[PDB]
Amino acid sequence: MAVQISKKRKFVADGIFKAELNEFLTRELAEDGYSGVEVRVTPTRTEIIILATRTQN
Amino acid sequence: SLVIPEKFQHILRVLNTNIDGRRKIAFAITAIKGVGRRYAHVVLRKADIDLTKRAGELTEDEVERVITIMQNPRQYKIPDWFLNRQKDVKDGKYSQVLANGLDNKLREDLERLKKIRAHRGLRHFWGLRVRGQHTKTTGRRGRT
Amino acid sequence: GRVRTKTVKKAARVIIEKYYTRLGNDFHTNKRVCEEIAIIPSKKLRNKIAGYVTHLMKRIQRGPVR
Amino acid sequence: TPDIKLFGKWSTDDVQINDISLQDYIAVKEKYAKYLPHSAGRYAAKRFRKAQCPIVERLTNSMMMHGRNNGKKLMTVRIVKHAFEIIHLLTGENPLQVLVNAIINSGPREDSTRIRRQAVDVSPLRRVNQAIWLLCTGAREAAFRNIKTIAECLADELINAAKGSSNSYAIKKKDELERVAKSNR
Amino acid sequence: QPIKLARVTKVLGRTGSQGQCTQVRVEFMDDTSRSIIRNVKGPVREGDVLTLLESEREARRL
Amino acid sequence: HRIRITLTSRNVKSLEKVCADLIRGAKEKNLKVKGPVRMPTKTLRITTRKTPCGEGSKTWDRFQMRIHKRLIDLHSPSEIVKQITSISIEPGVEVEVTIA
Amino acid sequence: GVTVKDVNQQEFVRALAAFLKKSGKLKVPEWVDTVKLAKHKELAPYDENWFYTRAASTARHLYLRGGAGVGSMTKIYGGRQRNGVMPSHFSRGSKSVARRVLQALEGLKMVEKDQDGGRKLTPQGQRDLDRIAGQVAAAKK
Amino acid sequence: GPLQSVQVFGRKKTATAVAHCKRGNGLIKVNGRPLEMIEPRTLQYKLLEPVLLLGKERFAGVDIRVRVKGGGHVAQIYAIRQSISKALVAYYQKYVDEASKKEIKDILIQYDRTLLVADPRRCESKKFGGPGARARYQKSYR
Amino acid sequence: VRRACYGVLRFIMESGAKGCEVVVSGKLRGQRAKSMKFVDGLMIHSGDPVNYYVDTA
Amino acid sequence: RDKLNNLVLFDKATYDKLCKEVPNYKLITPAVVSERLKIRGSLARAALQELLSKGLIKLVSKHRAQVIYTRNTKG
RNA sequence: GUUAAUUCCGAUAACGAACGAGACUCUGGCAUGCUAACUAGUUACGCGACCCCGGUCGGCGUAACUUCUUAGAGGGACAAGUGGCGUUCAGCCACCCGAGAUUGAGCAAUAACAGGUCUGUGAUGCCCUUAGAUGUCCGGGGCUGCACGCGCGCUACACUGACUGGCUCAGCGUGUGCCUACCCUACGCCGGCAGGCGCGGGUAACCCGUUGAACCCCAUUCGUGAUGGGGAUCGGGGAUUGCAAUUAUUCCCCAUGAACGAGGAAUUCCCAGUAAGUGCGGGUCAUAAGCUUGCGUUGAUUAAGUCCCUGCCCUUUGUACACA
Numbered sequence A: 001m002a003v004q005i006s007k008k009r010k011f012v013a014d015g016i017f018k019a020e021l022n023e024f025l026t027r028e029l030a031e032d033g034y035s036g037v038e039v040r041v042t043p044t045r046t047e048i049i050i051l052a053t054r055t056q057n
Numbered sequence B: 001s002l003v004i005p006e007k008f009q010h011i012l013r014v015l016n017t018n019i020d021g022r023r024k025i026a027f028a029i030t031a032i033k034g035v036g037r038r039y040a041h042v043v044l045r046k047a048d049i050d051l052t053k054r055a056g057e058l059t060e061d062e063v064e065r066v067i068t069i070m071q072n073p074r075q076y077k078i079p080d081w082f083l084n085r086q087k088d089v090k091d092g093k094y095s096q097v098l099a100n101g102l103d104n105k106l107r108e109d110l111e112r113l114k115k116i117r118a119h120r121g122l123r124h125f126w127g128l129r130v131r132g133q134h135t136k137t138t139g140r141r142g143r144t
Numbered sequence C: 001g002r003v004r005t006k007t008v009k010k011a012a013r014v015i016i017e018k019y020y021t022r023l024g025n026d027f028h029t030n031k032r033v034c035e036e037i038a039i040i041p042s043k044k045l046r047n048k049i050a051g052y053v054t055h056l057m058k059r060i061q062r063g064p065v066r
Numbered sequence D: 001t002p003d004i005k006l007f008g009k010w011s012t013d014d015v016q017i018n019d020i021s022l023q024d025y026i027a028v029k030e031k032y033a034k035y036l037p038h039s040a041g042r043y044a045a046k047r048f049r050k051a052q053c054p055i056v057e058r059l060t061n062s063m064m065m066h067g068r069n070n071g072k073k074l075m076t077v078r079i080v081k082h083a084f085e086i087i088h089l090l091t092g093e094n095p096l097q098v099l100v101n102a103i104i105n106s107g108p109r110e111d112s113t114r115i116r117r118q119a120v121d122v123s124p125l126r127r128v129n130q131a132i133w134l135l136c137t138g139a140r141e142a143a144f145r146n147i148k149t150i151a152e153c154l155a156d157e158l159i160n161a162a163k164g165s166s167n168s169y170a171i172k173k174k175d176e177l178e179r180v181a182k183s184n185r
Numbered sequence E: 001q002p003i004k005l006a007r008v009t010k011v012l013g014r015t016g017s018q019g020q021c022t023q024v025r026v027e028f029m030d031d032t033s034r035s036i037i038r039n040v041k042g043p044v045r046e047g048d049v050l051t052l053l054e055s056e057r058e059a060r061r062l
Numbered sequence F: 001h002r003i004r005i006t007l008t009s010r011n012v013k014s015l016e017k018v019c020a021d022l023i024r025g026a027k028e029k030n031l032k033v034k035g036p037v038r039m040p041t042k043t044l045r046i047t048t049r050k051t052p053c054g055e056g057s058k059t060w061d062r063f064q065m066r067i068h069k070r071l072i073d074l075h076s077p078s079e080i081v082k083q084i085t086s087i088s089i090e091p092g093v094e095v096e097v098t099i100a
Numbered sequence G: 001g002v003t004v005k006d007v008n009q010q011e012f013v014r015a016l017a018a019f020l021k022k023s024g025k026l027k028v029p030e031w032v033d034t035v036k037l038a039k040h041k042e043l044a045p046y047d048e049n050w051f052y053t054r055a056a057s058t059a060r061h062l063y064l065r066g067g068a069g070v071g072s073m074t075k076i077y078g079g080r081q082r083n084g085v086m087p088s089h090f091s092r093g094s095k096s097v098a099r100r101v102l103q104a105l106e107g108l109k110m111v112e113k114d115q116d117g118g119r120k121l122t123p124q125g126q127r128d129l130d131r132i133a134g135q136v137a138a139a140k141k
Numbered sequence H: 001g002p003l004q005s006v007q008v009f010g011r012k013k014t015a016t017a018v019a020h021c022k023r024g025n026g027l028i029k030v031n032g033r034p035l036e037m038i039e040p041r042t043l044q045y046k047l048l049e050p051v052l053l054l055g056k057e058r059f060a061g062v063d064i065r066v067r068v069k070g071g072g073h074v075a076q077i078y079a080i081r082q083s084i085s086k087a088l089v090a091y092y093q094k095y096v097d098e099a100s101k102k103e104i105k106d107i108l109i110q111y112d113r114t115l116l117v118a119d120p121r122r123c124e125s126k127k128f129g130g131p132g133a134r135a136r137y138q139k140s141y142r
Numbered sequence I: 001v002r003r004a005c006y007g008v009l010r011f012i013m014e015s016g017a018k019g020c021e022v023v024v025s026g027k028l029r030g031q032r033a034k035s036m037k038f039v040d041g042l043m044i045h046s047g048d049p050v051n052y053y054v055d056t057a
Numbered sequence J: 001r002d003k004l005n006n007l008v009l010f011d012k013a014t015y016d017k018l019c020k021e022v023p024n025y026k027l028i029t030p031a032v033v034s035e036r037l038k039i040r041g042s043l044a045r046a047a048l049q050e051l052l053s054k055g056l057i058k059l060v061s062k063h064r065a066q067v068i069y070t071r072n073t074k075g
Numbered sequence K: 001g002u003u004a005a006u007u008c009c010g011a012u013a014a015c016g017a018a019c020g021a022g023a024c025u026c027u028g029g030c031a032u033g034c035u036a037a038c039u040a041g042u043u044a045c046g047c048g049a050c051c052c053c054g055g056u057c058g059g060c061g062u063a064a065c066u067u068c069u070u071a072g073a074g075g076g077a078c079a080a081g082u083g084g085c086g087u088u089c090a091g092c093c094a095c096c097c098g099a100g101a102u103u104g105a106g107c108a109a110u111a112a113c114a115g116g117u118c119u120g121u122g123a124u125g126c127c128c129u130u131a132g133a134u135g136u137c138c139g140g141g142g143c144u145g146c147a148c149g150c151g152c153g154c155u156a157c158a159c160u161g162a163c164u165g166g167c168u169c170a171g172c173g174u175g176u177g178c179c180u181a182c183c184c185u186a187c188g189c190c191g192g193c194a195g196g197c198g199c200g201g202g203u204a205a206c207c208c209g210u211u212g213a214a215c216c217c218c219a220u221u222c223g224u225g226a227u228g229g230g231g232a233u234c235g236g237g238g239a240u241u242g243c244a245a246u247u248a249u250u251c252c253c254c255a256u257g258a259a260c261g262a263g264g265a266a267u268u269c270c271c272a273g274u275a276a277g278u279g280c281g282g283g284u285c286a287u288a289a290g291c292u293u294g295c296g297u298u299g300a301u302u303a304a305g306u307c308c309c310u311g312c313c314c315u316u317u318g319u320a321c322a323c324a
């Protein structure tokens, strides 16, 4: 990364990412039986697992 | 070398203000307005004087040398950052202002501000704190 | 201030009533006896159970315990 | 190798404690004999482990009060060293012996306590405590706002207390505590 | 009047309104058969000795 | 050949599982490795007032966030360490590779 | 044969001050008598020949550990500033006296500007300090 | 011949001091300088209790170089006081007869216990609502 | 309110749990704010197992 | 209330008073000499280091805070 | 009876249970045994410097090792052992062995207060006002105003000191930003200081940094005098951040030098690395700590107790109390 952010700020950055993601998803999916998320960052890609009840909805 | 000499002046008379010659010289010059401990020390270090003596122990040619130095600072290599009336408003000259001239020039700056009707001059005319402090809870008994 | 609670005393009486033939007289032996023989989740109450077992077995070799 | 000398100069032998009441609650003899009056500490854990502390260390502790100099033990070691030195050249004997005499003359024999007040004797350990404390406050109140330095005030307060001269602050308060004790008896 | 010093033989309990003087009972060191119960101020052990200024009065037991 | 991979996580047990996994991977692929170095746990300290308003007895939370950081260094070509670290990471551990 | 750390430092520095004075090559400035030695000092330095004493002291620190600069000298000669009714803090010394004293100690060859920045004590200054350390240890023996 | 080097640490409040003793002559010096000029110089007898209690007889064949880091002045002086002692103790139990170490450990312990085993004391944490460890800020009533 | 709460109660500890409690605080049965409390089963409250035995929302 | 009036250089009576009796005290400090001869402590320190250099009173221990002197031996 | 404990032994019209205490988690302490380290070091070795074979070096480079440092798994202490006390139970006291024979915190129940927060919110019910903004934005002021009363604090009232030199030691941490444009700074020049100008290191066990911190220690001067204590107030000058400092933002330099001589009744906090003194980090922050949160450093007096005051818990009894 061209600015090379410090990791003391990187862990609180992806923590705050996961927190904003959790609230945005739990308010979009309050009807739809949201339960949680789990991110995971591969090289070049991020597979991010939304975990809910009514997955058809 | 410890006996009291004859001609030991217990008091001196320098710029219409007393000098207690029982004290040491650098802290005995301090007794007149306009000179503090540091300016006293630098003035009688420019006047090459042994400091182990006291102000009543040294001689009158030396005291007139010292009063010429502290009345004429820049003509004896006193720095321009040292004086207390640096770049004054009326005649634009770096001077050390001393005992009887000190409170008169204080009165001049004070009545000058009261004359041009400044905020700080009005606060001096009202007898308050002028450097911007709070007056809600501190400094009562001087103002009743 | 060293009073053993009900979860120490009850469990130690259970270990003694089922395993008297392997338990002994010294703390440092029947400590690891108790560690092999029960799933005791921490060293602190593991040691407290084993110490209470030692005190009870000095009592048993004195006489019958209620 | 025996013969440990206090500050390397003062022998802990040749110290006779005349009074049998304060034998074990004083500490000047050979097991308690140290070089400096500075110790690592660990005396305030149990109740009476205060009493196994050497009294030179205890005086060096108790001179350290009234705000401006809390926790200046090294300075107090300096004060005690100069104090013992001028005690020796001013009186002419072992300053540890004049210290033990100052304690045994300055510790009050009975005190007053509200059970009005009843008069009750003191334990010997409180006798040692309040002796050392009265000596230290005598030195402090003598030296405050004064030319006479405090390693002199401690010294002449100790030798006045060991004479029992009633010119010592500690002996004055000790006798007045005992007279109010025998009045409130 | 004589100044007599006496040895604490056992400690009975603490008395006083603020709980500030331990009530012991002592043995006199010259007459070892005579024992007197008294209130002693401060930290007291068993087997230490007290400089009785007044050896006649006696505190009553709590 | 002298490469350095670095492993960093808030959580310690998955981190030392991943670190032991990479060490035993280098062991079974039979190349030399200097052991895991433990450079110190950086603690992130926040202390805030517990009350959203102002009043109350002045109590304070003490939030910590510990960060563990480990290093592994290898003497190996780049293709081998790509083949190793591509697999078997728990998503709490962040892995980074510096070649030279 | 002894070295600097083998002898007491408090008379080592006054011996080295007397050495540099009797040398008399040290290139003092002329604002010496008018300068306050820090922002946290309150008066002039009491000893009038203080510049040689400070040159001795900073040469001793340069012997003990090299790579010190003007900032390292202000940190090593910092002290309390009592701010009046505001609490006392720590403050650095004066930059210019440290700068001029390092320039004096490389004016006459005792220190030199080592890369990695900062001065380190040259072998001439090192043999000078060890000769006077032998001098001080002999004068105390 | 063989390098008989023992390196023993000693602890006070935070100051750790580790001493390195070899076989040589009786060279005791700390951080590149001997014992008798280490401030505070009022506390030189704390540096000198091992050598004065044991003489230079026990230290004749040993040289000790102590390196010190941490704490404050008398914490360092207490760590050196411990570490020189534990250095000669470990040197004796490794290279001479163990009854000599029994002698030297008994002589040092029955003088003081703080010179072979460490103080477990450290500065404990300030809690909120106080200026220090357990003192609290001043209550303000009416 | 109480039928919804008791339905959630019986459903979650038939779906398998050592206990639960459901707290509905607010305005109900008038205008003054009450709080209903629905507790059964095992329910630890203190210590470190609150971080990994108690699912809260 | 009270004010100590210490004189700052020697008059002749205090000077020969010091030259006679002060090398016969047991404990000579500046604080003792200041309250026995009614002089300043600074003048006392200067006079006592003068008497030391003349070789009449004996330094016993030197320190920043306190200097302490005796008289000579009797034998 | 016993415990810090509704903690247990045990009694028993109650039996079996749940919460709270405990258990726990982090921290402090102990490992010359394990795992390992060019972003930590030690010891040796070889050069190099210095002094009269040796000594010093945070000078240079590398052959072993992990004691110091880092940090993981383990381990370790349980009232285990001994002597007394006690239903000989629960347990208490003392002592050996010993790094420890109570380190400190976090979490913490049922029931509640009309305690605080709508000025934390895009959490919010209801009501407000129908261009002439209570939206929002800009310019200025105010949130700082001072006859007075109070609370939290800093500095002090000096010699156990101040001033001036000199000497010699830490640990918490933090550091270049999404918008966000403002970072920590070594080193070299100029200036007395505040600072200014250059080139550099650092997204950090790397650079600041071996964090050369204060108090402390040593050596000077002072000399009981509102004094070289105190530094309030106030004049003038110079710098720095800012779009802008007047109501002095902050820092520096000089001069000015008030009360204050240990504090009335009353009252706050505390018992071992504790009180206290002493500085250093974080937050606030463009500028910035008299606060607060953390951290070390120097480090005691006294106490191992009691219900007398202030309150709390349990039992019994009394009540005309029940917004008690």
Ligand SMILES: [Mg+2]
Pocket (backbone or CB within 6 Å): D143, D144, D145, D146, D147, D148, D149, D150, K159
């Ligand atoms: Mg005094």
Ligand SMILES: [Mg+2]
Pocket (backbone or CB within 6 Å): G076, G077, G078, G079
């Ligand atoms: Mg300094």
Ligand SMILES: [Mg+2]
Pocket (backbone or CB within 6 Å): I044, I045, I046
């Ligand atoms: Mg529970």
Ligand SMILES: [Mg+2]
Pocket (backbone or CB within 6 Å): I046, I047
């Ligand atoms: Mg708990």
Ligand SMILES: [Mg+2]
Pocket (backbone or CB within 6 Å): K114
């Ligand atoms: Mg309300």
Ligand SMILES: [Mg+2]
Pocket (backbone or CB within 6 Å): K128, K129
């Ligand atoms: Mg309306």
Ligand SMILES: [Mg+2]
Pocket (backbone or CB within 6 Å): K143
């Ligand atoms: Mg306001």
Ligand SMILES: [Mg+2]
Pocket (backbone or CB within 6 Å): none
């Ligand atoms: Mg002043």
Ligand SMILES: [Mg+2]
Pocket (backbone or CB within 6 Å): none
């Ligand atoms: Mg003044």
Ligand SMILES: [Mg+2]
Pocket (backbone or CB within 6 Å): none
């Ligand atoms: Mg109260």
Ligand SMILES: [Mg+2]
Pocket (backbone or CB within 6 Å): K291
């Ligand atoms: Mg605030």
Ligand SMILES: [Mg+2]
Pocket (backbone or CB within 6 Å): K318
């Ligand atoms: Mg009735």
